[PDB]
Amino acid sequence: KVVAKGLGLSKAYVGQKSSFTVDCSKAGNNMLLVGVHGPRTPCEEILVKHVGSRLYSVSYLLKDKGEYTLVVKWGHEHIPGSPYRVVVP
Amino acid sequence: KVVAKGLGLSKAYVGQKSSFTVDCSKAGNNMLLVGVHGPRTPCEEILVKHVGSRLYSVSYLLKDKGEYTLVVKWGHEHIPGSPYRVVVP
């Protein structure tokens, strides 16, 4: 009952914040875990903000071209669509 | 082989950013995940930054008093000390 949306689920660009949301309004009081895995150059930054009504706005910053793995877990289980493949040109 | 350090592992105050570091320099190329579980009001913000050489800075922001659980995982296993109990006055 958790739903992710946004451009950052699939794309990011060097040096620019990529954004997506995770809507947990229809879920309970569990723990959200978000990470972006760069197997060579790590993700530079990731920010997860609760903006109200159990909507979370996520922004992350990548430094290098290539494929990254975006993981979004709710109670330690992948939300639908996770793990996501993120491509940086 | 991951080591976390800092006051933010055990102390946080409403409205004030709480910080710690996570040293993954002696670990491999696995994935790092950080969560702050409030049984009630969610964590407002969590910011994770790779500061270089596989050291990471973490800052988080809470909006209500109470007991929180801070989770730091490396390849989906808890790092030593995780889960951390954080009591906000």
mmCIF file of C-alpha atoms in Angstrom:
data_model
loop_
_atom_site.group_PDB
_atom_site.id
_atom_site.type_symbol
_atom_site.label_atom_id
_atom_site.label_comp_id
_atom_site.label_asym_id
_atom_site.label_seq_id
_atom_site.Cartn_x
_atom_site.Cartn_y
_atom_site.Cartn_z
ATOM 1 C CA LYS A 1 0.000 0.000 0.000
ATOM 2 C CA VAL A 2 3.067 2.220 -0.479
ATOM 3 C CA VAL A 3 3.414 3.990 -3.852
ATOM 4 C CA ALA A 4 6.536 5.646 -5.310
ATOM 5 C CA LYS A 5 6.435 8.177 -8.136
ATOM 6 C CA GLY A 6 8.730 10.584 -9.945
ATOM 7 C CA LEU A 7 11.509 11.023 -12.478
ATOM 8 C CA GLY A 8 14.250 9.993 -10.018
ATOM 9 C CA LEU A 9 12.935 6.427 -9.959
ATOM 10 C CA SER A 10 14.606 5.919 -13.355
ATOM 11 C CA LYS A 11 16.830 8.878 -14.295
ATOM 12 C CA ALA A 12 19.418 11.223 -12.827
ATOM 13 C CA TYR A 13 21.987 13.617 -14.271
ATOM 14 C CA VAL A 14 25.510 14.408 -13.069
ATOM 15 C CA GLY A 15 25.520 17.198 -10.481
ATOM 16 C CA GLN A 16 21.747 17.800 -10.463
ATOM 17 C CA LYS A 17 19.311 16.787 -7.738
ATOM 18 C CA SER A 18 17.065 13.955 -8.886
ATOM 19 C CA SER A 19 13.710 13.672 -7.128
ATOM 20 C CA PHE A 20 11.002 11.140 -6.364
ATOM 21 C CA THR A 21 8.280 10.656 -3.766
ATOM 22 C CA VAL A 22 7.110 7.770 -1.609
ATOM 23 C CA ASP A 23 3.454 7.941 -0.550
ATOM 24 C CA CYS A 24 2.895 6.001 2.672
ATOM 25 C CA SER A 25 -0.561 7.488 3.470
ATOM 26 C CA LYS A 26 -2.333 4.145 3.027
ATOM 27 C CA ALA A 27 0.259 2.277 5.104
ATOM 28 C CA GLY A 28 0.870 2.204 8.887
ATOM 29 C CA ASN A 29 3.577 3.396 11.271
ATOM 30 C CA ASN A 30 6.477 1.429 9.812
ATOM 31 C CA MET A 31 10.034 2.428 8.896
ATOM 32 C CA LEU A 32 11.037 3.708 5.472
ATOM 33 C CA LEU A 33 14.584 3.021 4.215
ATOM 34 C CA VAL A 34 15.902 4.623 1.041
ATOM 35 C CA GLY A 35 19.320 4.163 -0.548
ATOM 36 C CA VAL A 36 21.038 4.672 -3.872
ATOM 37 C CA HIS A 37 23.885 2.300 -4.531
ATOM 38 C CA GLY A 38 26.754 3.296 -6.775
ATOM 39 C CA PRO A 39 29.128 0.260 -6.942
ATOM 40 C CA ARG A 40 32.039 2.499 -7.969
ATOM 41 C CA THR A 41 31.480 6.152 -7.103
ATOM 42 C CA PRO A 42 28.916 6.215 -4.260
ATOM 43 C CA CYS A 43 25.844 8.395 -4.333
ATOM 44 C CA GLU A 44 27.013 11.840 -3.154
ATOM 45 C CA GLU A 45 23.937 12.776 -1.103
ATOM 46 C CA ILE A 46 20.438 11.644 -0.416
ATOM 47 C CA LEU A 47 17.763 13.542 1.475
ATOM 48 C CA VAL A 48 14.484 12.009 2.625
ATOM 49 C CA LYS A 49 11.951 14.521 3.911
ATOM 50 C CA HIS A 50 8.529 13.878 5.396
ATOM 51 C CA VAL A 51 6.476 16.683 3.813
ATOM 52 C CA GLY A 52 3.189 15.790 5.514
ATOM 53 C CA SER A 53 0.413 13.213 5.379
ATOM 54 C CA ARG A 54 3.011 10.407 5.175
ATOM 55 C CA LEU A 55 4.285 11.680 1.822
ATOM 56 C CA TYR A 56 8.087 11.617 1.602
ATOM 57 C CA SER A 57 10.019 13.726 -0.867
ATOM 58 C CA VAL A 58 13.412 12.223 -1.756
ATOM 59 C CA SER A 59 16.260 13.988 -3.565
ATOM 60 C CA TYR A 60 19.656 12.533 -4.392
ATOM 61 C CA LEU A 61 22.855 13.618 -6.092
ATOM 62 C CA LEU A 62 25.105 11.508 -8.299
ATOM 63 C CA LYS A 63 28.563 12.443 -9.557
ATOM 64 C CA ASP A 64 29.297 9.868 -12.261
ATOM 65 C CA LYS A 65 27.717 8.315 -15.341
ATOM 66 C CA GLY A 66 26.567 4.691 -15.144
ATOM 67 C CA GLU A 67 23.969 2.421 -13.587
ATOM 68 C CA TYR A 68 22.872 2.825 -9.970
ATOM 69 C CA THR A 69 20.455 0.772 -7.862
ATOM 70 C CA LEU A 70 17.753 2.636 -5.993
ATOM 71 C CA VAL A 71 16.258 0.694 -3.057
ATOM 72 C CA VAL A 72 13.078 1.766 -1.261
ATOM 73 C CA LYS A 73 12.035 -0.473 1.632
ATOM 74 C CA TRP A 74 9.010 -0.212 3.877
ATOM 75 C CA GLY A 75 9.387 -2.417 6.964
ATOM 76 C CA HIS A 76 12.551 -3.929 5.431
ATOM 77 C CA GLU A 77 10.604 -5.163 2.322
ATOM 78 C CA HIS A 78 10.851 -3.648 -1.145
ATOM 79 C CA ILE A 79 7.943 -1.439 -2.149
ATOM 80 C CA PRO A 80 6.451 -2.255 -5.558
ATOM 81 C CA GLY A 81 9.042 -1.377 -8.190
ATOM 82 C CA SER A 82 12.044 -1.622 -5.866
ATOM 83 C CA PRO A 83 14.880 -2.231 -6.589
ATOM 84 C CA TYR A 84 14.878 0.410 -9.339
ATOM 85 C CA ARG A 85 17.505 0.760 -12.069
ATOM 86 C CA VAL A 86 18.748 4.357 -12.351
ATOM 87 C CA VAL A 87 20.685 5.385 -15.428
ATOM 88 C CA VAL A 88 22.972 8.437 -15.479
ATOM 89 C CA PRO A 89 24.170 9.514 -18.970
ATOM 90 C CA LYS B 1 33.959 -3.703 9.577
ATOM 91 C CA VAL B 2 31.724 -0.605 9.526
ATOM 92 C CA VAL B 3 32.056 1.811 12.477
ATOM 93 C CA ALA B 4 29.619 4.609 13.441
ATOM 94 C CA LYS B 5 30.510 7.463 15.770
ATOM 95 C CA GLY B 6 28.845 10.541 17.200
ATOM 96 C CA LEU B 7 26.393 12.063 19.650
ATOM 97 C CA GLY B 8 23.534 11.554 17.164
ATOM 98 C CA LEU B 9 23.684 7.796 17.797
ATOM 99 C CA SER B 10 22.133 8.365 21.225
ATOM 100 C CA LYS B 11 20.955 11.994 21.505
ATOM 101 C CA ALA B 12 18.557 14.203 19.543
ATOM 102 C CA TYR B 13 16.420 17.219 20.357
ATOM 103 C CA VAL B 14 13.163 18.435 18.794
ATOM 104 C CA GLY B 15 13.823 20.782 15.859
ATOM 105 C CA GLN B 16 17.628 20.525 16.057
ATOM 106 C CA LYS B 17 19.693 18.558 13.521
ATOM 107 C CA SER B 18 21.389 15.538 15.090
ATOM 108 C CA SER B 19 24.559 14.154 13.480
ATOM 109 C CA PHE B 20 26.847 11.148 13.374
ATOM 110 C CA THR B 21 29.295 9.531 10.948
ATOM 111 C CA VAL B 22 29.570 6.060 9.433
ATOM 112 C CA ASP B 23 33.022 4.779 8.414
ATOM 113 C CA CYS B 24 32.843 2.151 5.660
ATOM 114 C CA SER B 25 36.479 2.604 4.537
ATOM 115 C CA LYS B 26 37.425 -0.923 5.721
ATOM 116 C CA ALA B 27 34.317 -2.548 4.225
ATOM 117 C CA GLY B 28 33.528 -3.484 0.598
ATOM 118 C CA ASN B 29 31.255 -1.990 -2.061
ATOM 119 C CA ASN B 30 27.965 -2.874 -0.398
ATOM 120 C CA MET B 31 24.897 -0.684 0.175
ATOM 121 C CA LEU B 32 24.334 1.613 3.167
ATOM 122 C CA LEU B 33 20.801 2.357 4.515
ATOM 123 C CA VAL B 34 19.762 4.640 7.398
ATOM 124 C CA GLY B 35 16.274 4.883 8.925
ATOM 125 C CA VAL B 36 14.802 6.605 11.955
ATOM 126 C CA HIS B 37 11.699 4.970 13.211
ATOM 127 C CA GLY B 38 9.237 6.952 15.234
ATOM 128 C CA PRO B 39 6.302 4.827 16.469
ATOM 129 C CA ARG B 40 4.167 7.954 16.151
ATOM 130 C CA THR B 41 5.307 11.095 14.294
ATOM 131 C CA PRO B 42 7.773 10.328 11.447
ATOM 132 C CA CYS B 43 11.324 11.608 11.292
ATOM 133 C CA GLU B 44 11.247 14.998 9.516
ATOM 134 C CA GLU B 45 14.497 14.732 7.529
ATOM 135 C CA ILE B 46 17.389 12.390 7.073
ATOM 136 C CA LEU B 47 20.424 13.483 5.048
ATOM 137 C CA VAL B 48 23.182 11.002 4.177
ATOM 138 C CA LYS B 49 26.309 12.319 2.428
ATOM 139 C CA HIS B 50 29.346 10.479 1.151
ATOM 140 C CA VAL B 51 32.150 12.774 2.378
ATOM 141 C CA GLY B 52 34.925 10.792 0.646
ATOM 142 C CA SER B 53 36.998 7.643 1.146
ATOM 143 C CA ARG B 54 33.773 5.775 2.036
ATOM 144 C CA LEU B 55 33.089 7.909 5.114
ATOM 145 C CA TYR B 56 29.543 9.157 5.452
ATOM 146 C CA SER B 57 27.910 12.011 7.361
ATOM 147 C CA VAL B 58 24.344 11.532 8.601
ATOM 148 C CA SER B 59 22.048 14.270 9.931
ATOM 149 C CA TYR B 60 18.423 13.821 10.999
ATOM 150 C CA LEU B 61 15.652 16.024 12.358
ATOM 151 C CA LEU B 62 12.816 15.043 14.689
ATOM 152 C CA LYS B 63 9.717 17.031 15.513
ATOM 153 C CA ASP B 64 8.325 15.376 18.646
ATOM 154 C CA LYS B 65 9.693 14.000 21.914
ATOM 155 C CA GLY B 66 9.744 10.264 22.684
ATOM 156 C CA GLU B 67 11.766 7.158 21.957
ATOM 157 C CA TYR B 68 13.019 6.575 18.440
ATOM 158 C CA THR B 69 14.916 3.724 16.822
ATOM 159 C CA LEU B 70 17.845 4.603 14.627
ATOM 160 C CA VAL B 71 18.766 1.866 12.113
ATOM 161 C CA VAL B 72 22.060 1.755 10.196
ATOM 162 C CA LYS B 73 22.484 -1.152 7.812
ATOM 163 C CA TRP B 74 25.260 -2.293 5.528
ATOM 164 C CA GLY B 75 24.138 -4.858 2.952
ATOM 165 C CA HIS B 76 20.891 -5.254 4.907
ATOM 166 C CA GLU B 77 22.825 -6.310 8.086
ATOM 167 C CA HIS B 78 22.959 -4.031 11.142
ATOM 168 C CA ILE B 79 26.316 -2.373 11.709
ATOM 169 C CA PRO B 80 27.724 -2.805 15.231
ATOM 170 C CA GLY B 81 25.470 -0.886 17.620
ATOM 171 C CA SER B 82 22.440 -0.842 15.320
ATOM 172 C CA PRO B 83 19.581 -0.633 16.142
ATOM 173 C CA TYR B 84 20.261 2.438 18.288
ATOM 174 C CA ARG B 85 17.819 3.736 20.895
ATOM 175 C CA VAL B 86 17.425 7.510 20.787
ATOM 176 C CA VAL B 87 15.387 9.191 23.520
ATOM 177 C CA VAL B 88 14.228 12.708 22.694
ATOM 178 C CA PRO B 89 13.275 14.848 25.731
#
